[PDB]
Amino acid sequence: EKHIHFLFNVSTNSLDPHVDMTYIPVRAGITETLVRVDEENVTIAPWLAESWDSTDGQHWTIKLREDVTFQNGKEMDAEAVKASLERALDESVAIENALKIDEIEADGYTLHITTKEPFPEFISELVNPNVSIIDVTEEDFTNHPVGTGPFALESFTPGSKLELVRYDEYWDGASKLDSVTFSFNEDASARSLALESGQADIVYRPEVESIETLQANEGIMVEATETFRTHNLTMNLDRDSLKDVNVRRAVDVLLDRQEIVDTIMLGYAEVADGPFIPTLPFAPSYEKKETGTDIAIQYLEEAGYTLENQMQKDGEPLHFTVLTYGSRAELPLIAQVFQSNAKQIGIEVEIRQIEVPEEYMASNRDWDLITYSNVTSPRGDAGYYLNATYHPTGALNFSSVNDPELTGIIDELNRTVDQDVRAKLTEQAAAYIDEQKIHSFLIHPSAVVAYDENKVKNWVTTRSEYYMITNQLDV
Numbered sequence: 216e217k218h219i220h221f222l223f224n225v226s227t228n229s230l231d232p233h234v235d236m237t238y239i240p241v242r243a244g245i246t247e248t249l250v251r252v253d254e255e256n257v258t259i260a261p262w263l264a265e266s267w268d269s270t271d272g273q274h275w276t277i278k279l280r281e282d283v284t285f286q287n288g289k290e291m292d293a294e295a296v297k298a299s300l301e302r303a304l305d306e307s308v309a310i311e312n313a314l315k316i317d318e319i320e321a322d323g324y325t326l327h328i329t330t331k332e333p334f335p336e337f338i339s340e341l342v343n344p345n346v347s348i349i350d351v352t353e354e355d356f357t358n359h360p361v362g363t364g365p366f367a368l369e370s371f372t373p374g375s376k377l378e379l380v381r382y383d384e385y386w387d388g389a390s391k392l393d394s395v396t397f398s399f400n401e402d403a404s405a406r407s408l409a410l411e412s413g414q415a416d417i418v419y420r421p422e423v424e425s426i427e428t429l430q431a432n433e434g435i436m437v438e439a440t441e442t443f444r445t446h447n448l449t450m451n452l453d454r455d456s457l458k459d460v461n462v463r464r465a466v467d468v469l470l471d472r473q474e475i476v477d478t479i480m481l482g483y484a485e486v487a488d489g490p491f492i493p494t495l496p497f498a499p500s501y502e503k504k505e506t507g508t509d510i511a512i513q514y515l516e517e518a519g520y521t522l523e524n525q526m527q528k529d530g531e532p533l534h535f536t537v538l539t540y541g542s543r544a545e546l547p548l549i550a551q552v553f554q555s556n557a558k559q560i561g562i563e564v565e566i567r568q569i570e571v572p573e574e575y576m577a578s579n580r581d582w583d584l585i586t587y588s589n590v591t592s593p594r595g596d597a598g599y600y601l602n603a604t605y606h607p608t609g610a611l612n613f614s615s616v617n618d619p620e621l622t623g624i625i626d627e628l629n630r631t632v633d634q635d636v637r638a639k640l641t642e643q644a645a646a647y648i649d650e651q652k653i654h655s656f657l658i659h660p661s662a663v664v665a666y667d668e669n670k671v672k673n674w675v676t677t678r679s680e681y682y683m684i685t686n687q688l689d690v
């Protein structure tokens with residue numbers, strides 16, 4: 216018998232893919248979405264749906280595959296998909312408010328969806344594991360979701376494990392796995408042990424101090440992958456210091472990104488050359504740059520700052536107040552390293568450990584930089600991020616960022632339906648954000664997986680982090 220025990224990060228007492236928020240239904244391979252993020256190109260690809268169109272971004276048309284069936288056997292047709300979408304809008308306010316769906320008419324396998332208003336980024340919302348398609352003619356959602364995954368649910372123990380049996384008629388080709396145990400444990404080293412003791416085959420996010428021990432075990436492999444989140448120093452352009460391009464350029468060099476990968480992240484991360492990961496279809500190639508305490512001086516010089524007896528221009532000291540916070544324990548360390556480099560070069564930094572990012576609007580005033588963090592391309596689209604962080608009106612715009620050329624692009628971008636041009640515009644906004652150095656992008660933290668190399672075949676660690684248990688896995 217072919218069995219895989221996968222031991223997961225996070226627990227849950229529900230398997231309602233609509234209320235859940237842990238995305239476990241999709242993670243354990245019960246459940247799937249109309250549309251996915253392709254592992255090869257990192258773009259929005261059809262899964263449950265074959266294709267889509269929108270002349271105008273408001274009237275959307277989705278053709279679905281004619282060959283899919285739910286685990287219980289029933290056909291998956293537009294009506295079924297209507298039901299599921301609907302059950303999902305009437306059950307989660309988050310889903311309701313994000314999908315923006317006015318109406319959904321059904322016929323055969325095509326669907327007609329009308330968003331409240333033109334929603335160019337509508338399709339990318341269907342990637343959300345939340346909107347995974349389930350059979351609604353099947354009542355026990357907390358404990359028994361019936362979806363289209365390669366694994367049907369056998370049994371469920373809230374707060375503990377779930378049990379899954381291969382589904383024999385899975386539309387994309389049946390697992391060779393006889394069965395999977397998908398279980399949860401919130402303690403990182405408990406996880407490490409479980410793998411070591413051989414009580415688990417695959418562990419997600421194993422302990423960082425231990426990672427050294429396991430790795431070394433004869434037969435255990437650890438993979439790591441780039442995620443969509445990026446760490447950065449977010450700047451405050453309402454400050455005169457930073458209104459200068461070269462003052463920014465300089466901050467951008469004061470930190471040695473590789474040393475963050477190693478001295479702090481421990482290797483559990485990758486250098487960011489920007490907000491977007493290289494593999495994305497809309498990421499720029501970047502000139503490969505040298506960046507240390509030396510190179511800082513040169514930019515700060517061009518800007519008009521020399522070190523006298525303290526960096527200064529004219530009569531006033533150069534300094535920054537760099538906020539940081541608790542929620543992410545490596546951030547305060549980047550903070551402390553930044554101030555250690557600042558001082559080598561003439562600059563004092565007040566490191567202020569704030570709690571919450573609300574402070575930026577309230578404290579408003581004082582602060583120059585914050586050791587911050589965003590997911591920039593949550594399901595292959597960067598339109599929300601960019602608009603939020605860069606457009607004058609942007610919800611998250613706290614650096615009083617307002618560059619009309621940029622706003623130019625974001626504007627066309629928000630009025631643009633076609634996936635390939637959305638792509639072209641994002642590269643430009645990216646490019647432009649580089650040239651003008653609007654923030655400093657430090658690292659991309661890694662999702663990390665460890666597993667028994669000799670039992671487990673074809674584990675892929677996915678960037679979206681939505682995909683873990685899948686038909687491809689074997690023992």
Ligand SMILES: [Ca+2]
Binds near residue numbers: 383
């Ligand atoms: Ca069977």
